[PDB]
């Protein structure tokens, strides 16, 4: 079906560029205007690009006009925008759009691609397990936990025994402070199923190529 | 350059309710030919923000009966007549018929329900942690409502510490609920010198544990 693919989102150093991606699929590419639409850290979304369906007409706001720079290759079905001149101003979550031809403006939309312009350094994060003392029960369940702290960029994946453990799960989003933030999730399961068998914390940091599985035991 | 406004920036409204969400421009936006642009948009907590209503009224594929964009005057206003536990996320109006396309800054629905009481859990620094000079408690304080919950960090028996990070999830759309963890980062030296540890959610719900290890 009709499916849009951002990438090349990454951590960048003030007036450094870089280059985003749309790949786009189920319908015709050349037919269709295509955009890109950030949203802010504050969750504020902003308009950042239109292109014509020939491309050519392109369609820039004032703030990024001369540093951004949106093109396209209908022959591969793909959309791209030229990051130039960063600022921290810059750093968002970057969709990309397609136009529903005399309908509506953003009919279908990505998963979206985080950029980050900062003059931080990539950390890697430090994965902590975490468990009740003693292996304490608390009743018919048992609450385990994961603490994912001093990581940059943003940019981290945590899930429990591979995926198998999706139910009672609780990623809690992720808290800067001092350009290093810090995650943690919980999972519920019953009595009968940790001290059997054993629990494992999956954490991946792309940005340092950072994968580690903490088993949590007591 | 044309703002649109949205009031109110937060809406908690009961479940199978109706809701009204209202954006007005600071300019006249109603075309006199059959082109004006005036769309809403939903993020559900963790996606893409999705299409629901486009020029001013009509309804796009998928979305459910429920929903209507009025609109007329300068006050766009979208109505969802059944809330439902999975209508929860953010609204934005996007304007387009003016070339500086711009934003609203957005309302976050909020489904009412009964109140109910965390699940608090506290959790003693890992050895690894403790061993690279570092101590961080932490306590969950899962599924409650409403959000508007306290929580005091208490070293032996009296210490109410301050320096906490905490973290709040979006509301669930299951249940309704909030969750959240409190993270209290000290040295392995200054947590080495103290013994019990709490965690307090405020008739308090209080958990702690002793020692500095088990």
């Known amino acids: 079906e009709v499916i849009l693919v951002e990438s090349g989102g990454g951590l960048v150093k003030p007036g450094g560029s870089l280059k985003l991606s749309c790949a786009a699929s189920?319908?015709?590419?050349?037919?269709?205007?295509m955009s890109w639409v950030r949203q802010t850290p504050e969750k504020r979304l902003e308009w950042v690009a239109t292109?014509?369906?020939?491309?050519?007409?392109?369609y820039y706001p004032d703030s990024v006009k001369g540093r951004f720079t949106i093109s396209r290759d209908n022959a591969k079905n793909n959309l791209y925008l030229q990051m130039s001149s960063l600022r921290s101003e810059d750093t968002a979550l970057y969709y990309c759009?397609?136009?529903?031809?005399?309908?509506?403006?953003?009919?279908?939309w990505g998963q979206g691609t985080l950029v980050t312009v900062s003059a931080a350094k990539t950390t890697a994060p430090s994965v902590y397990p975490l468990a009740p003392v003693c292996g304490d029960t608390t009743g018919s369940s048992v609450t385990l936990g994961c603490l994912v702290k001093g990581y940059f960029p943003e940019p981290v994946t945590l899930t429990w025994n591979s995926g198998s453990l999706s139910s009672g799960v609780h990623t809690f989003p992720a808290v800067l402070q001092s350009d290093l933030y810090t995650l943690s999730s919980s999972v519920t399961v019953t009595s009968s199923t940790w001290p059997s068998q054993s629990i494992t914390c999956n954490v991946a940091h792309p940005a340092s190529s950072t994968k580690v599985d903490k088993k949590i035991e007591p | 350059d044309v703002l649109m406004t949205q009031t109110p920036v937060s809406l908690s409204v009961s479940l199978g309710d109706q809701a009204s969400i209202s954006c007005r421009s600071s300019?006249?936006?109603?075309?006199?030919?059959?082109?004006?642009?005036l769309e809403w948009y939903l993020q559900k907590p963790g996606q893409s923000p999705k299409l629901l209503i486009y020029?001013?009224?009509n309804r796009f594929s998928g979305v459910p009966d429920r929903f209507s964009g009025s609109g007329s005057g300068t006050d766009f206003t979208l109505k969802i007549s059944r809330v439902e536990a999975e209508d929860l996320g953010v609204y934005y109006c996007?304007?387009?018929?003016?070339?500086?396309?711009?934003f609203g800054g957005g309302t976050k629905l909020e489904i009412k329900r009964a109140d109910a009481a965390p699940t608090v859990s506290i959790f003693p620094p890992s050895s690894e942690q403790l061993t690279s000079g570092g101590a961080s408690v932490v306590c969950f304080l899962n599924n409650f409502y409403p959000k508007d919950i306290n929580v005091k960090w208490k070293i032996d028996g009296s210490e109410r510490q301050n320096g906490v990070l905490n973290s709040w999830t979006d509301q669930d759309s299951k249940d309704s609920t909030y969750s959240m963890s409190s993270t209290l980062t000290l040295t392995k030296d200054e947590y080495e010198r103290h013994n019990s540890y709490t965690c307090e959610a405020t008739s308090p719900i209080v958990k702690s544990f002793n020692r500095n290890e088990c």
């Open positions: 759009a397609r136009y529903y031809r005399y309908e509506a403006w953003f009919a279908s």
């Open positions: 189920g319908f015709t590419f050349s037919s269709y205007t």
């Open positions: 292109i014509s369906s020939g491309g050519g007409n392109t």
């Open positions: 300019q006249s936006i109603v075309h006199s030919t059959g082109n004006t642009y």
């Open positions: 020029k001013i009224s």
């Open positions: 996007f304007q387009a018929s003016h070339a500086p396309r711009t």
